[PDB]
Amino acid sequence: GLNDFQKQKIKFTFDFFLDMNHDGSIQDNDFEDMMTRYKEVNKGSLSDADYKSMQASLEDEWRDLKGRADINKDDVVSWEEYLAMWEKTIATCKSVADLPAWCQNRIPFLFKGMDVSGDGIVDLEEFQNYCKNFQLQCADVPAVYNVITDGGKVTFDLNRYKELYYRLLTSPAADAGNTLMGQKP
Amino acid sequence: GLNDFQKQKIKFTFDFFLDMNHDGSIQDNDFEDMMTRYKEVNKGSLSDADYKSMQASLEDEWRDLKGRADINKDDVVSWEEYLAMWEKTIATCKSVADLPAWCQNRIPFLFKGMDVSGDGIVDLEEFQNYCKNFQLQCADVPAVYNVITDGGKVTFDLNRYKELYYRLLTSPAADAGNTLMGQKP
Ligand SMILES: [Ca+2]
Numbered sequence: 001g002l003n004d005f006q007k008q009k010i011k012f013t014f015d016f017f018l019d020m021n022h023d024g025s026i027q028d029n030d031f032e033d034m035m036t037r038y039k040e041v042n043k044g045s046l047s048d049a050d051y052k053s054m055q056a057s058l059e060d061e062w063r064d065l066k067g068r069a070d071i072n073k074d075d076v077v078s079w080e081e082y083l084a085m086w087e088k089t090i091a092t093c094k095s096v097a098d099l100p101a102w103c104q105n106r107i108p109f110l111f112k113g114m115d116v117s118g119d120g121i122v123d124l125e126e127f128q129n130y131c132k133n134f135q136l137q138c139a140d141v142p143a144v145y146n147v148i149t150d151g152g153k154v155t156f157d158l159n160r161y162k163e164l165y166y167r168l169l170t171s172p173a174a175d176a177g178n179t180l181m182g183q184k185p
Numbered sequence: 186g187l188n189d190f191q192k193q194k195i196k197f198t199f200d201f202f203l204d205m206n207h208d209g210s211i212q213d214n215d216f217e218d219m220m221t222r223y224k225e226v227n228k229g230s231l232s233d234a235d236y237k238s239m240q241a242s243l244e245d246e247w248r249d250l251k252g253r254a255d256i257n258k259d260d261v262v263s264w265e266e267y268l269a270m271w272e273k274t275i276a277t278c279k280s281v282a283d284l285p286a287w288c289q290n291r292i293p294f295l296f297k298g299m300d301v302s303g304d305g306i307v308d309l310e311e312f313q314n315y316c317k318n319f320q321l322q323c324a325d326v327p328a329v330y331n332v333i334t335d336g337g338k339v340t341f342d343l344n345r346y347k348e349l350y351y352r353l354l355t356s357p358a359a360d361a362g363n364t365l366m367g368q369k370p
């Protein structure tokens with residue numbers, strides 16, 4: 001099975017990364033809420049076409065999730081089906097490159113919402129904001145950021161992101177992927 | 186000092202039990218927000234006098250917190266002063282009965298907001314609601330409830346509450362006080 005810890009972090013992604021409207025189910029409306037968030041904050045900074053593209057990748061994301069986790073075909077992914085989906089992939093995956101495709105769209109989407117500045121690096125202030133406007137318990141933000149940047153050896157970029165997302169989803173033990181929940185391992 | 190774990194749970198109470206408006210500081214306005222919450226949900230079920238009493242205990246609570254943690258006298262308790270306050274009491278406390286007095290008002294207030302039904306027991310559905318309308322990651326609510334009720338040996342009442350609040354605030358290790366963050370030890 002998955003241990004407690006694993007299930008805790010899986011709940012974490014259900015809740016914070018997918019169930020935008022908080023009803024205990026993943027459904028297209030959750031994805032429409034991502035879009036609302038998107039337009040909400042970017043407004044006219046983005047063109048109509050940009051929102052359209054964004055939408056197509058969300059549609060395409062929902063489609064891949066729905067088609068993998070919705071066992072009884074009612075267009076709703078419940079927690080239980082979402083757990084089941086994770087138990088199946090943890091059972092056999094080894095790098096970010098093995099995750100189900102819907103993940104390949106969730107990763108960049110999550111990263112770009114953190115990198116408020118567009119340089120492809122989430123700096124400390126951006127991280128601190130991640131922790132705030134995402135209610136996580138970051139008690140020493142600089143120390144959580146140092147686990148991520150590994151004492152300044154590693155830049156918090158997309159390839160760093162990818163690694164941590166992976167660990168958040170699959171490790172049977174507290175490691176750096178924990179930083180995404182705003183905690184130190 | 187306090188270890189990481191301890192500091193994590195302390196952040197938890199700052200954030201969920203006191204900083205209602207989310208600005209990284211505890212201030213009277215946070216307490217006014219408790220009152221707003223209170224009237225928000227109880228409306229006319231409570232009389233004017235009941236709100237007044239409630240207010241007096243919050244005022245009295247703020248007063249005791251402010252007078253213990255506000256080191257530079259600016260009527261704002263920051264995270265750092267709140268951490269400092271906790272480092273001081275963990276250093277020397279042994280039962281719920283040793284916690285600073287402001288706690289003696291936070292405990293019942295938190296308990297009565299969980300016990301939506303008024304019987305002095307927070308049952309499983311109430312707990313489940315605690316976990317929802319309080320965004321915690323309860324991945325198996327019945328299993329978290331069984332750590333609290335200890336397999337049905339113990340009723341989830343105020344004296345049970347008190348014990349767990351205590352452990353949440355002071356243990357240097359994962360135990361039953363963790364259930365209040367909606368997690369299994
Ligand atoms: Ca939903």
Ligand SMILES: [Ca+2]
Pocket residue numbers: 069070071072073074075076077078081
């Ligand atoms: Ca379904």
Ligand SMILES: [Ca+2]
Pocket residue numbers: 114115116117118119120121122123126
């Ligand atoms: Ca950036």
Ligand SMILES: [Ca+2]
Pocket residue numbers: 203204205206207208209210211212215
């Ligand atoms: Ca505040």
Ligand SMILES: [Ca+2]
Pocket residue numbers: 254255256257258259260261262263266
């Ligand atoms: Ca102060």
Ligand SMILES: [Ca+2]
Pocket residue numbers: 299300301302303304305306307308311
């Ligand atoms: Ca009750």
